[PDB]
Amino acid sequence: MGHKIDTKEDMKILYSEIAELRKKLNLNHLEIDDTLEKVAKEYAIKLGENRTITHTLFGTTPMQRIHKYDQSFNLTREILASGIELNRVVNAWLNSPSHKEALINTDTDKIGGYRLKTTDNIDIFVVLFGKRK
């Protein structure tokens, strides 16, 4: 895998876009969560190293990946994207019924994600949603 590029600013844009979408629907406000951000980043790097996009890499599930760091999450969702520009990704997820369901969910109060963008043209979003016990 090539070198990673900083995407902090990208994720600030994306969080803001998702927040505005949810606000226009009068849905609940999601707070950015450090644990979800760490899990999303670790997973995004594995997806990129292994040349795949999948929710079940190495026999893990999104809940299980989050429970490795914090077992108090009792409800979670995961959305992925690859090869899609930042200013197109929300609409690309809205066009998928299962992805749209996650973006407009009322079950979770926390969000955290990561964008992997590398020098060899890997471009992956991982966005997680969660609710703690």
Walk me through what this model shows.
With 133 residues, this protein is α+β, with helices and mostly antiparallel strands. It has a single domain (1-133), classed as CAP (Pathogenesis-related Protein p14a, 3-Layer(aba) Sandwich). The chain has helices spanning 8-24, 34-50, 62-67, 89-94, 97-103, and strands spanning 31-32, 73-82, 110-117, 123-132. Strands 1-3-4-2 form a four-stranded mixed sheet. Strand 3 (110-117) and strand 4 form a beta hairpin. The radius of gyration is 14 Å and the shape is globular. The protein starts with 7 loop residues before the first helix and ends with a strand.
Using brief descriptors, characterize the structure shown:
monomer; 133 residues; alpha+beta; Pathogenesis-related Protein p14a; 4-stranded mixed β-sheet
Brief account:
The protein has 133 residues and is of the alpha+beta class.
Q: What's the CATH H-level superfamily name?
A: CAP
Oligomer: monomer
CATH C-level category: Alpha Beta
Termini separation (Å)?
A: 37 Å
Instruction: State Rg.
Output: 14 Å
**Helix share bin:** 25-40%
Number of extended strands: 4
* Coarse structural class: alpha+beta
Topology as a string of helices (H) and strands (E)? HEHHEHHEE
| Proportion of beta-strand residues | 15-25%
What is the fold named in CATH at topology level? Pathogenesis-related Protein p14a
CATH architecture: 3-Layer(aba) Sandwich
Largest sheet: 4 strands, mixed
Count the helices. How many? 5
Counted up, domains total 1
Overall outline: globular
- Strand order in the largest sheet: 1-3-4-2
